[PDB]
Amino acid sequence: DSRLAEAAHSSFARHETFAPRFGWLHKAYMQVQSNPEAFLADDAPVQLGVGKNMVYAMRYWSRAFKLTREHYGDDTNSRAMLSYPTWEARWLLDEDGADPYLEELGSLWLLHWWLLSSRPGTKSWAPSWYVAFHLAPFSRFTLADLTQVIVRHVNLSFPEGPVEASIAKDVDCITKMYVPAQRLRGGEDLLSCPFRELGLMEQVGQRGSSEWEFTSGSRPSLPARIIAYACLDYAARTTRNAGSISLARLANEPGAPGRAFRIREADIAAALEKVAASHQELQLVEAVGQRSLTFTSGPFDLAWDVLDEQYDNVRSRPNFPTREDWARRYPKLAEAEKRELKQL
Amino acid sequence: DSRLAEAAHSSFARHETFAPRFGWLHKAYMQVQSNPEAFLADDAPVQLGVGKNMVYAMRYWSRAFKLTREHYGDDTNSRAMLSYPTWEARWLLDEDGADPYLEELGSLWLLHWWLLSSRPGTKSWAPSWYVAFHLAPFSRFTLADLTQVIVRHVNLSFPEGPVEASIAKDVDCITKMYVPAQRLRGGEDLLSCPFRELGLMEQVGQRGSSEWEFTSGSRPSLPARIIAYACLDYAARTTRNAGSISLARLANEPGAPGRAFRIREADIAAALEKVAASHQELQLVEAVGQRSLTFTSGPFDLAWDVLDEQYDNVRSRPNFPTREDWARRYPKLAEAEKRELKQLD
Ligand SMILES: [Mg+2]
Ligand SMILES: [Mg+2]
Structure with a gap:
């Protein structure tokens, strides 16, 4: 293990x-x-x-x-x-x-x-x-x-x-x-x-x-867009393009939002449905028939669109640096990432 | 009423x-x-x-x-x-x-x-x-x-x-x-x-x-000096000299710490014992045989000694202003107090 x-x-x-x-x-x-x-x-x-x-x-x-x-x-x-x-x-x-x-x-x-x-x-x-x-x-x-x-x-x-x-x-x-x-x-x-x-x-x-x-109740303090961000951020661990992820995996896989937030599959679907209604690029689809989250471009970027909207689009503000701005300001952040990677 | x-x-x-x-x-x-x-x-x-x-x-x-x-x-x-x-x-x-x-x-x-x-x-x-x-x-x-x-x-x-x-x-x-x-x-x-x-x-x-x-359980997050401050702050509402106030009043009177913090008289008694042990001017007294808190000087200044101790004596830090220093920087603080006191016709 x-x-x-x-x-x-x-x-x-x-x-x-x-x-x-x-x-x-x-x-x-x-x-x-x-x-x-x-x-x-x-x-x-x-x-x-x-x-x-x-x-x-x-x-x-x-x-x-x-x-x-x-x-x-x-x-x-x-x-x-x-x-x-x-x-x-x-x-x-x-x-x-x-x-x-x-x-x-x-x-x-x-x-x-x-x-x-x-x-x-x-x-x-x-x-x-x-x-x-x-x-x-x-x-x-x-x-x-x-x-x-x-x-x-x-x-x-x-x-x-x-x-x-x-x-x-x-x-x-x-x-x-x-x-x-x-x-x-x-x-x-x-x-x-x-x-x-x-x-x-x-x-x-x-x-x-x-x-x-x-505990295992409902989470009235957990906003739908926070769940949706985490699900797309979790999907982005393994994919950078359009695609999908099953709700079963989001609810039960180790590392995923279901165990991190201790919420049931139904609460994840409810959050994703609410957020999907505001984002053309995201949908809940019922297949065979299990529900899947789909995204028409890379899930990391959509994760941050959903997260930034929860806070009234901080990245639009005057003089807000991009990730690429930040990486050039602090190049050692990428160097720390690289040395973590070259152990894999 | x-x-x-x-x-x-x-x-x-x-x-x-x-x-x-x-x-x-x-x-x-x-x-x-x-x-x-x-x-x-x-x-x-x-x-x-x-x-x-x-x-x-x-x-x-x-x-x-x-x-x-x-x-x-x-x-x-x-x-x-x-x-x-x-x-x-x-x-x-x-x-x-x-x-x-x-x-x-x-x-x-x-x-x-x-x-x-x-x-x-x-x-x-x-x-x-x-x-x-x-x-x-x-x-x-x-x-x-x-x-x-x-x-x-x-x-x-x-x-x-x-x-x-x-x-x-x-x-x-x-x-x-x-x-x-x-x-x-x-x-x-x-x-x-x-x-x-x-x-x-x-x-x-x-x-x-x-x-x-x-609620009405125990309050492990309520420090004893916070209780004693409130008790002495409460006594200072009515007196500026040495005096006393009963634990029953502290625990039950409207406005007092017992009702604010929702703590019972014994919990108040226990906090006050701990603080009187370091403060010779504070004592828990038995009278007939109701317990009272007593203070040998004005309660408001003792209140703030006890409260400042809870936070490592902030008033001793370099350049911390006295209330006199502060009232000279912000003269309208005293003016707002005097305005309200003269509503007490
Ligand atoms: Mg308004
Ligand atoms: Mg160590």
Whole structure:
């Protein structure tokens, strides 16, 4: 088994037991935009306004949410892994972007998709999150049961061999990231975490009992265009031209929006139907008779047409850079992608 | 039944049913700091980064959370109410301040207290919230129930009166502010609201059914210094000298922390023990045999010692302004307070 090795980097507990914070995403984008050394400077804890271990966590979460890519010097400098903002970060978090203050719940659903997402050249930095949402056998678990599940997947997927204590720390942090704070004990310490608003995870049988579970209701906070974006972005993992993808695969394949968002096939179809009605190039077709999503040109570009429309077409704004503008401004983003590729 | 009139201004539905947004608090502070006309300018939507239909909601929430005050400018033959940031906003929301990005849940508890709080010279801007937390005789309700208890309290307090439709909009907004996003139904519509993390309101018994309730469990996200601040801030409403206030009043009196935070007397007692252990001027006393909190000096200054401690003593940082420094930069803050105090005929 190497579903996981093919989708995720070997990366555990680099969040340093810290769940994401809005202030960290915001401040990381602002500093890194003009300073590649913003996380590595001896200056960082005061320049970022956080403790020293929070600097690394900030750096990790930037990487994990696909808001930055890392690559060496030179100009020398060193082997130092400097950070570079992605075009998606410029699109989302810029003061001129889609949702710089994460006012819309669809933006959190989007960031959640990027944390789990993977494609050739760009794997996930949260293998424990990927196992939990895409590969775990059961919806209810103890933290030690889920920990054991990830250990077994890491053992069959990576040459290194599992660090149980680090994987246990991922499981603590998943819990803090998705579960309501009333189901947490803080020895006051308790921090906000905006991904709790997604309602993806709950305590069970609350003593609080030792068990936790992922939910399975409807997702009124998940916008249709966010589902449609993820389905077309998932289709674009393997195709760059016109074509189709079955709804069954979108609902059930590991990596796809059904498991990422924990939504049923019917909720995917309902989102795609609503979005298709506004986009001539997209249709739901019932074949033999299973439903398929069709697209008359490459699905990556249509994905971003649907996503940009959810935020009133950010790419139309004055002086908004194109991906090709961004790539020339930050050529190391492509170089980081290439070195991921030349392992395949 | 003048309780609501003494506690709250006659202000209903000015938020247009938009629940608070962190970006709204943060950007309004960044702009009002240097521009008293931030909410009135032709270019407000672009400079505040919001739609034209959101500017007033944003202006309202800043005032309601005691983050701004409003007063006429120095501009003759003009009645427009200009905005000025409060010292509390400088302490909390500045990049140099306590929690500019609302990273700690105690900051949301605190903002919630500010929304509900009331003092001679600074009443609440959220009468429907005041009624819902402090005056309603029940805790479980349909939205039509909550609307009608507010309507009943408003007719006793404000002759002028909003229309019922305005109060209903307040109640929709109360719901979206506090209940989990999974209980709401949009058109996509749903916005984040960080006050939902406080776990204060939940859907109950549904189907159908149409019921809601304020919750009543334990509050592990409510820090003890936040409780003690509110208790001392509450005592300071009526006294500026050494004195005392009973735990029963703190836990049960309308306007006090027990009803604002929906916590029981023992939870208040436990928070106050923790804080009195580091504060020799605070004590929990047994009298006959009711417990009281006592303070050997003025409660308001002790309140802010306790609150500033929760955030690592922000007032000690280099160049942090005193309230005297701030009142000289923004003289109309005191003018807006004096205006309201002389409405207390
Ligand atoms: Mg480390
Ligand atoms: Mg308006």
